[PDB]
Scaffold this active site. Sequence first.
Site, PDB file in Angstrom:
ATOM      1  N   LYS A  13       0.828  -1.377  -0.207  1.00 42.75           N
ATOM      2  CA  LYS A  13       0.100  -0.041   0.085  1.00 42.75           C
ATOM      3  C   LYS A  13       0.861   1.311   0.014  1.00 42.75           C
ATOM      4  O   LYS A  13       0.581   2.285  -0.895  1.00 42.75           O
ATOM      5  CB  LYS A  13      -0.939  -0.251   1.253  1.00 42.75           C
ATOM      6  CG  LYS A  13      -2.075  -1.280   1.285  1.00 42.75           C
ATOM      7  CD  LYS A  13      -2.827  -1.384   2.428  1.00 42.75           C
ATOM      8  CE  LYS A  13      -2.187  -1.295   3.870  1.00 42.75           C
ATOM      9  NZ  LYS A  13      -1.224  -2.468   3.940  1.00 42.75           N
ATOM     10  N   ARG A  85      -8.199   1.817  10.158  1.00 38.97           N
ATOM     11  CA  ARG A  85      -7.730   0.563  10.605  1.00 38.97           C
ATOM     12  C   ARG A  85      -8.940  -0.075  11.479  1.00 38.97           C
ATOM     13  O   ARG A  85      -8.783  -1.078  11.965  1.00 38.97           O
ATOM     14  CB  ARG A  85      -6.479   0.552  11.425  1.00 38.97           C
ATOM     15  CG  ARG A  85      -5.348   0.934  10.641  1.00 38.97           C
ATOM     16  CD  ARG A  85      -4.847   0.131   9.306  1.00 38.97           C
ATOM     17  NE  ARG A  85      -3.671  -0.795   9.920  1.00 38.97           N
ATOM     18  CZ  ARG A  85      -2.468  -0.407   9.878  1.00 38.97           C
ATOM     19  NH1 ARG A  85      -2.367   0.862   9.479  1.00 38.97           N
ATOM     20  NH2 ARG A  85      -1.419  -1.216  10.291  1.00 38.97           N
ATOM     21  N   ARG A 124      11.712  -6.204   4.126  1.00 44.69           N
ATOM     22  CA  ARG A 124      11.411  -4.758   4.076  1.00 44.69           C
ATOM     23  C   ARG A 124      12.734  -4.022   4.721  1.00 44.69           C
ATOM     24  O   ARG A 124      12.879  -4.407   5.843  1.00 44.69           O
ATOM     25  CB  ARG A 124      10.169  -4.285   4.693  1.00 44.69           C
ATOM     26  CG  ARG A 124       9.919  -2.778   4.466  1.00 44.69           C
ATOM     27  CD  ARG A 124       8.467  -2.478   4.730  1.00 44.69           C
ATOM     28  NE  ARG A 124       7.908  -2.538   5.901  1.00 44.69           N
ATOM     29  CZ  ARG A 124       6.588  -2.282   6.259  1.00 44.69           C
ATOM     30  NH1 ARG A 124       5.708  -2.045   5.236  1.00 44.69           N
ATOM     31  NH2 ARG A 124       6.363  -2.664   7.503  1.00 44.69           N
ATOM     32  N   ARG A 150      12.977  -2.086  10.249  1.00 41.95           N
ATOM     33  CA  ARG A 150      12.096  -1.861  11.320  1.00 41.95           C
ATOM     34  C   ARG A 150      11.899  -2.843  12.468  1.00 41.95           C
ATOM     35  O   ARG A 150      11.723  -3.952  12.143  1.00 41.95           O
ATOM     36  CB  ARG A 150      10.629  -1.261  10.723  1.00 41.95           C
ATOM     37  CG  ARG A 150      10.611   0.173  10.006  1.00 41.95           C
ATOM     38  CD  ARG A 150       9.516   0.142   9.164  1.00 41.95           C
ATOM     39  NE  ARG A 150       8.187  -0.324   9.683  1.00 41.95           N
ATOM     40  CZ  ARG A 150       7.137  -0.264   9.205  1.00 41.95           C
ATOM     41  NH1 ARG A 150       6.864   0.277   8.040  1.00 41.95           N
ATOM     42  NH2 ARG A 150       5.923  -0.649   9.847  1.00 41.95           N
ATOM     43  N   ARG A 161       1.007  -8.131  14.312  1.00 42.26           N
ATOM     44  CA  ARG A 161       0.362  -7.181  13.250  1.00 42.26           C
ATOM     45  C   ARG A 161      -0.522  -7.988  12.264  1.00 42.26           C
ATOM     46  O   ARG A 161      -1.578  -7.014  11.975  1.00 42.26           O
ATOM     47  CB  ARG A 161       1.504  -6.603  12.387  1.00 42.26           C
ATOM     48  CG  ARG A 161       2.192  -5.425  13.281  1.00 42.26           C
ATOM     49  CD  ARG A 161       3.488  -5.068  12.588  1.00 42.26           C
ATOM     50  NE  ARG A 161       3.430  -4.373  11.070  1.00 42.26           N
ATOM     51  CZ  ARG A 161       3.985  -4.314  10.405  1.00 42.26           C
ATOM     52  NH1 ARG A 161       5.322  -4.787  10.566  1.00 42.26           N
ATOM     53  NH2 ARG A 161       3.857  -3.593   9.292  1.00 42.26           N
TER      54      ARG A 161
HETATM   55  N1  LIG Z   1      -4.840   4.038  11.375  1.00 46.03           N
HETATM   56  C1  LIG Z   1      -4.162   3.571  12.594  1.00 46.03           C
HETATM   57  N2  LIG Z   1      -4.882   3.263  13.633  1.00 46.03           N
HETATM   58  C2  LIG Z   1      -3.939   2.639  14.649  1.00 46.03           C
HETATM   59  N3  LIG Z   1      -2.494   2.626  14.661  1.00 46.03           N
HETATM   60  C3  LIG Z   1      -2.070   2.794  13.591  1.00 46.03           C
HETATM   61  C4  LIG Z   1      -2.725   3.524  12.299  1.00 46.03           C
HETATM   62  N4  LIG Z   1      -1.863   3.452  11.354  1.00 46.03           N
HETATM   63  C5  LIG Z   1      -0.675   2.998  12.008  1.00 46.03           C
HETATM   64  N5  LIG Z   1      -0.681   2.537  13.220  1.00 46.03           N
HETATM   65  C6  LIG Z   1       0.483   2.068  14.054  1.00 46.03           C
HETATM   66  O1  LIG Z   1       1.523   2.304  13.262  1.00 46.03           O
HETATM   67  C7  LIG Z   1       2.188   0.997  13.148  1.00 46.03           C
HETATM   68  C8  LIG Z   1       2.748   0.884  11.730  1.00 46.03           C
HETATM   69  O2  LIG Z   1       1.700   1.085  10.843  1.00 46.03           O
HETATM   70  P1  LIG Z   1       1.952   1.215   9.190  1.00 46.03           P
HETATM   71  O3  LIG Z   1       3.422   1.790   8.898  1.00 46.03           O
HETATM   72  O4  LIG Z   1       0.546   1.624   8.519  1.00 46.03           O
HETATM   73  O5  LIG Z   1       2.404  -0.419   8.971  1.00 46.03           O
HETATM   74  P2  LIG Z   1       2.426  -1.322   7.607  1.00 46.03           P
HETATM   75  O6  LIG Z   1       3.683  -0.606   7.059  1.00 46.03           O
HETATM   76  O7  LIG Z   1       2.198  -2.837   7.907  1.00 46.03           O
HETATM   77  O8  LIG Z   1       1.296  -0.361   6.728  1.00 46.03           O
HETATM   78  C9  LIG Z   1       0.829   0.148  13.238  1.00 46.03           C
HETATM   79  O9  LIG Z   1       1.339  -1.286  13.455  1.00 46.03           O
HETATM   80  C10 LIG Z   1       0.303   0.584  14.339  1.00 46.03           C
HETATM   81  O10 LIG Z   1       0.733   0.510  15.698  1.00 46.03           O
HETATM   82  N1  LIG Z   2       4.061  -5.558  -5.765  1.00 41.77           N
HETATM   83  C1  LIG Z   2       5.087  -6.099  -5.117  1.00 41.77           C
HETATM   84  N2  LIG Z   2       6.136  -7.042  -5.403  1.00 41.77           N
HETATM   85  C2  LIG Z   2       7.231  -7.320  -4.541  1.00 41.77           C
HETATM   86  N3  LIG Z   2       7.577  -6.463  -3.320  1.00 41.77           N
HETATM   87  C3  LIG Z   2       6.529  -5.489  -2.893  1.00 41.77           C
HETATM   88  C4  LIG Z   2       5.376  -5.056  -3.945  1.00 41.77           C
HETATM   89  N4  LIG Z   2       4.979  -3.991  -3.260  1.00 41.77           N
HETATM   90  C5  LIG Z   2       5.881  -3.647  -2.217  1.00 41.77           C
HETATM   91  N5  LIG Z   2       6.610  -4.538  -1.867  1.00 41.77           N
HETATM   92  C6  LIG Z   2       7.989  -4.646  -0.996  1.00 41.77           C
HETATM   93  O1  LIG Z   2       7.319  -5.216  -0.086  1.00 41.77           O
HETATM   94  C7  LIG Z   2       7.465  -4.591   1.278  1.00 41.77           C
HETATM   95  C8  LIG Z   2       5.908  -4.193   1.665  1.00 41.77           C
HETATM   96  O2  LIG Z   2       5.710  -3.055   0.861  1.00 41.77           O
HETATM   97  P1  LIG Z   2       5.001  -1.728   1.607  1.00 41.77           P
HETATM   98  O3  LIG Z   2       4.426  -0.690   0.175  1.00 41.77           O
HETATM   99  O4  LIG Z   2       5.860  -1.102   2.639  1.00 41.77           O
HETATM  100  O5  LIG Z   2       3.596  -2.294   2.293  1.00 41.77           O
HETATM  101  P2  LIG Z   2       2.276  -1.713   3.178  1.00 41.77           P
HETATM  102  O6  LIG Z   2       2.695  -0.172   3.038  1.00 41.77           O
HETATM  103  O7  LIG Z   2       1.200  -2.273   2.559  1.00 41.77           O
HETATM  104  O8  LIG Z   2       2.781  -2.386   4.536  1.00 41.77           O
HETATM  105  C9  LIG Z   2       8.591  -3.470   1.002  1.00 41.77           C
HETATM  106  O9  LIG Z   2       9.773  -3.986   1.162  1.00 41.77           O
HETATM  107  C10 LIG Z   2       8.433  -3.187  -0.505  1.00 41.77           C
HETATM  108  O10 LIG Z   2       9.479  -2.838  -1.108  1.00 41.77           O
END
Ligand SMILES: Nc1ncnc2c1ncn2[C@@H]1O[C@H](COP(=O)(O)OP(=O)(O)O)[C@@H](O)[C@H]1O
Ligand SMILES: Nc1ncnc2c1ncn2[C@@H]1O[C@H](COP(=O)(O)OP(=O)(O)O)[C@@H](O)[C@H]1O
Length: 203
Positions: A13, A85, A124, A150, A161
């Site tokens: 995303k 979320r 990642r 991270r 998560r």
């Molecule tokens: N909309 C939200 N509501 C509550 N907590 C959030 C939200 N967005 C992010 N967080 C917190 O930040 C952490 C990292 O979120 P995010 O970067 O969106 O994870 P991911 O990379 O898996 O999308 C989450 O696991 C949560 O603890």
């Molecule tokens: N379509 C895809 N195919 C392979 N790897 C991906 C793709 N999209 C994202 N990634 C990689 O997968 C990991 C998660 O992507 P990210 O955009 O951070 O996911 P989200 O925000 O949904 O948690 C990152 O290391 C990114 O470089």
Amino acid sequence: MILVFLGPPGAGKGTQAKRLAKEKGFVHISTGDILREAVQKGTPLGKKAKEYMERGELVPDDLIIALIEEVFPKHGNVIFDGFPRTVKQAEALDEMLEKKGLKVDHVLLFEVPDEVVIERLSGRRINPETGEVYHVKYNPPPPGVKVIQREDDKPEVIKKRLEVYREQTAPLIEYYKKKGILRIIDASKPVEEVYRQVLEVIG
Ligand SMILES: Nc1ncnc2c1ncn2[C@@H]1O[C@H](COP(=O)(O)OP(=O)(O)O)[C@@H](O)[C@H]1O
Ligand SMILES: Nc1ncnc2c1ncn2[C@@H]1O[C@H](COP(=O)(O)OP(=O)(O)O)[C@@H](O)[C@H]1O
């Protein structure tokens, strides 16, 4: 136009939102990015949020809803990336938008199986200088470029998560399906293919 990107952690995303914002001029609202900045800066939000994030739990709704009100732009198209979320967050978003004369136009559900989620998250990496996101297999950092992993991308926190996603966030699929604005994205495909699908969906 207001978009919500919904789906399991690791679905891609943020990758897609960054690209879409850069190329098409959407305002990218990443609650994750904003929270990580708050934690690093040690703000009252950051100090409170930090431990939830460390443990893979959601930060409480009130804090996130306030954060969104703080950063929502007066003008511009918006990508909500990682928000809402929870059902409560989604209800608050609808209410906030309605007061502004706006609404969620499309909710894109980034579908990927659990095996892919783990592969994506475990690999990642982040360039701490620029915030650019890499993947050890699918998009490795250039030679010599220092990156970090991270703490919440460690195996046990990924597990939490994903559980949190299934319990609290997945009900949003039906929430938005009922409103008829849910669009399915096959997020298991390569970045370029996913991006074309995102563009097609939003027209
Ligand atoms: N909309 C939200 N509501 C509550 N907590 C959030 C939200 N967005 C992010 N967080 C917190 O930040 C952490 C990292 O979120 P995010 O970067 O969106 O994870 P991911 O990379 O898996 O999308 C989450 O696991 C949560 O603890
Ligand atoms: N379509 C895809 N195919 C392979 N790897 C991906 C793709 N999209 C994202 N990634 C990689 O997968 C990991 C998660 O992507 P990210 O955009 O951070 O996911 P989200 O925000 O949904 O948690 C990152 O290391 C990114 O470089």
